[PDB]
Design a protein around this ligand. Structure first.
Ligand SMILES: [Mn+2]
Ligand SMILES: [Mn+2]
Lengths: 612, 161
DNA sequence: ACTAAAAT
């Protein structure tokens, strides 16, 4: 044994994959003390001399930020004391897995360290935590040589991993400090506000004992969206439409419905005048005929957000249940990594191979074989964010081995994958325009030409209707009767889970692996209730919370504040700011705001008297 | 000279009572019908002007408007979208106009696309109607040909919140 | 008892 290097990955599966790819099939595997982390050993070359590679993995975050003693037990420190006087430390998360001791024992005697962690922002923090754990126990450097290394990768293919090993770099302390500052700020603000709220409202309003009222940079805006929807529903007054429609018949038992060019009229007398201008008539002339081709775009790659949206809108699944099922499928080895926000396929990918694997299931075998015979289509281009490749099938499952929820998710994933590589949908749309006296109506229809991804995603199909009769300009037809209909504008309905997710994504509230957690949190704190149709309905306590926050200080329930704080904190990452100089200022502004909030609580207090 | 000045303004179609004409301008040694017109186009028509709209025009038994007319808009409302959404591109634009001259108020309907009169047009704007205008059910039909828009601000005491 | 991040 001359020299050994150590590699750390963020998932055990990814660790095994990289070890297999770079070890060319020769491995020596061993089980560590944790029982969920494995150590792989193999020989190779690193920097001109033979080196023994030792590969291992850590499970997600290793340390989490918390308070010391005497301050983590409430009823002993004033909440305002937490803002700028409470000592802070880092303690292990998931203590059952002795990650720190495992890293020390497995890194003892190592010389070089290589970090195959994720390329996102929340990866370099794990990077520097691992360095703080491992650097104390390691052979001291010689001369002026660089020891710590980092690798950049996107996919888990042979060429990508080998090139990533070929070219290496260094980590970014200024990037890690941004995440550290965010953690500190979030913990301070949340623990400051929640304690005061739940210590004031609990003991003075009856049936809120043994209840928790929580505040934070995500839960509160999430509740704000739903209560804004509730207010909009509560403050809607109906109006009255007046739509005019008439029917024209050409052959016996062949009538045709028409639509007015001016869709709506809101004045009864005006509508009556238009009707009287049309009712006593017997001809129908033809003005113009239309015939254009069009295409329905094939779906892009699959993201976690779109998975959650479709699961909650078509399969009757909550976001947390969907995430658990997806994680189980990943662990068993049926789908790729299920927490990604990249919608662009990697350049090097065995698309043909993955498609050829699913060439035996009776549900889509014909389409798979036809695509393989006639050549596949290139995927639709999209956004890339490093991170991980999109969600694709890996093995061939059946109805039997999986059951219920797992199969219902697997079918949708496989169908989406097959559709994203198939052709488009081509349909011709024919619109014919008739003239009745002084007014003109139109009617439109569609007909299919060559179905594409519709053959695999029927719910996106083009409905079939009888083809519009062919006519030339100048033809005249008889009209049956011209009549009016009265309608009322409909009020909006409560938010659905899909709408809440798409509102969360654009404003920056939450992330790819926190939306289910936040939704489930606001459901567990009895802030909202899930009704029929997977609709989130605000309850009395949440309505009071937001209607008080707006009256007292409005930026708390405001989606833009999280984006503003993130933009301000990015300066630390870019190297154009100072850590303390930013953190102290951003904590001082919030401290002043909280000190105002505590003295302006009577306004929110006088709002719960009309309820519990 | 006012005897010929009245005939000139009538031929131009700017019908307005002689007392109002005298009020607008009182013989600065010359009528100067041009400056009379310019001064009028920034004056409220309710105070000054004669009554010439056909009686019971708001009923449904006139069916005709012959000769040229001058009218003043009062309120403009888009009857194609609810008051909640004052401009939604879900239906084509369609405007109802509340015009006046003297003692009688009349209602008009767009019936085509006219770019001259927009939702932002302030009240008091003067409209000239030329030729023959159709009245259907007490509603005046406003074709693009038989309209002329002449501006002028008198009291834009209107605020949208 | 809090908050918000990753992972199985
Ligand atoms: Mn990760
Ligand atoms: Mn992410």
């Amino acid at each position: 044994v001359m020299k050994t290097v150590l590699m750390v990955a963020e998932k055990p599966s990814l660790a095994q994959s990289i070890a297999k790819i770079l070890s060319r099939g020769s491995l020596s595997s061993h089980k560590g003390l944790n029982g969920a982390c494995s150590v792989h050993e193999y020989t190779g070359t690193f920097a001109g001399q033979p080196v023994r590679f030792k590969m291992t993995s850590v499970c997600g975050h290793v340390m989490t930020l918390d308070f010391l003693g005497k301050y983590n037990k409430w009823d002993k420190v004033d909440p305002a004391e937490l803002f700028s006087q409470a000592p802070t430390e880092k303690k292990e998360a998931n203590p059952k897995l002795n990650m720190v001791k495992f890293l020390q024992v497995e890194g003892r005697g190592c010389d070089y360290i290589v970090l195959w962690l994720d390329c996102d922002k929340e990866g370099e923090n794990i990077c520097f935590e691992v360095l703080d754990a491992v650097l104390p126990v390691m052979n001291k450097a010689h001369g002026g040589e660089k020891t710590v290394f980092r690798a950049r990768f996107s996919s888990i293919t042979d060429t990508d991993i080998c090139n990533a090993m070929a070219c290496l770099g260094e980590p970014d302390h200024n990037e890690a400090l941004s995440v550290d500052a965010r953690q500190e700020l979030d913990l301070r603000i949340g623990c400051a506000f929640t304690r005061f709220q739940t210590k004031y409202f609990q003991g003075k309003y009856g049936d809120l004992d043994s209840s928790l009222i929580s505040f934070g940079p995500c839960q509160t805006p999430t509740l704000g969206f739903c209560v804004e929807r509730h207010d909009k529903i509560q403050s809607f007054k109906p109006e009255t439409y007046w739509v005019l429609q008439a029917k024209v018949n050409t052959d016996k038992d062949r009538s045709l419905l028409l639509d007015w060019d001016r869709v709506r009229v809101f004045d009864r007398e005006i509508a009556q005048m238009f009707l009287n201008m049309t009712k006593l008539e017997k001809e129908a002339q033809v003005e113009a005929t239309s015939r254009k081709e069009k295409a329905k775009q094939r779906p892009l790659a699959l993201n976690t957000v779109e998975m959650l949206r479709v699961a909650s809108s078509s399969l009757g699944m909550g976001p947390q249940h969907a995430m658990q099922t997806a994680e189980r499928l990943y662990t068993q080895g049926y789908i790729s990594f299920p927490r990604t926000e990249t919608t662009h396929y990697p350049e090097n990918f065995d698309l043909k191979g993955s498609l050829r694997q699913q060439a035996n299931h009776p549900y889509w075998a014909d389409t798979v074989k036809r695509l393989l015979a006639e050549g596949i289509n290139r995927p639709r281009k999209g956004h890339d964010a490093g991170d991980h490749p999109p969600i694709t099938p890996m093995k061939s499952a059946t109805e039997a081995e999986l059951g219920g929820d797992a199969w219902r998710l697997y079918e949708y994933i496989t169908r989406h994958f097959i559709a994203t590589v198939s052709h488009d949908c081509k349909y011709l749309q024919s619109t014919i325009s008739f003239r009745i006296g002084p007014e003109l109506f139109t009617c439109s229809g569609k007909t299919v030409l060559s179905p594409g991804f519709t053959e695999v995603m029927p719910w996106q199909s083009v409905p079939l209707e009888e083809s519009l009769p062919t006519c030339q300009r100048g033809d005249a037809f008889p009209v049956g009767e011209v009549k009016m209909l009265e309608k009322q504008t409909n009020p909006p309905d409560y938010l659905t889970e899909a709408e809440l997710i798409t509102l969360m994504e654009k404003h920056g509230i939450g992330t790819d692996a926190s939306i289910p957690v936040h939704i489930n949190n606001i459901c567990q704190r009895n802030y909202v209730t899930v009704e029929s149709g997977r609709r989130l309905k605000p309850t009395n306590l949440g309505i009071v919370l937001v209607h008080g926050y707006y009256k007292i200080d409005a930026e708390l329930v405001l989606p833009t504040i999280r984006s503003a704080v993130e933009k301000q904190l990015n300066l630390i990452a870019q190297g154009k700011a100072d850590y303390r100089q930013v953190l102290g200022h951003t904590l001082d502004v919030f401290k002043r705001k909280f000190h105002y909030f505590v003295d302006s609580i009577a306004g929110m207090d006088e709002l719960m008297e009309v309820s519990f | 000279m006012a005897q010929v000045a009245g005939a000139a303004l009538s031929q131009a179609g700017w019908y307005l009572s002689d007392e109002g004409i005298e009020a607008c301008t009182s013989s600065p040694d010359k009528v100067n019908v041009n400056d009379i017109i310019l001064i009028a186009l920034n004056t409220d028509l309710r105070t000054i002007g004669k009554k010439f709209l056909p009686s019971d025009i708001n009923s449904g038994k006139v069916e005709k408007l012959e000769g040229p007319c001058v009218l003043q808009i009062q309120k403009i409302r888009n009857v194609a979208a609810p008051k909640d959404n004052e401009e939604s591109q879900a239906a084509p634009r369609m405007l109802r106009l509340q015009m006046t001259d003297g003692h009688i108020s009349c209602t008009a309907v767009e019936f085509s696309y006219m770019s001259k009169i927009s939702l932002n047009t302030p009240p008091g704007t003067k409209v000239k109607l030329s030729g023959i205008v159709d009245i259907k059910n007490g509603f005046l039909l406003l074709n693009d040909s038989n309209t002329t828009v002449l501006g002028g601000e008198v009291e834009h005491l209107i605020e949208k919140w």
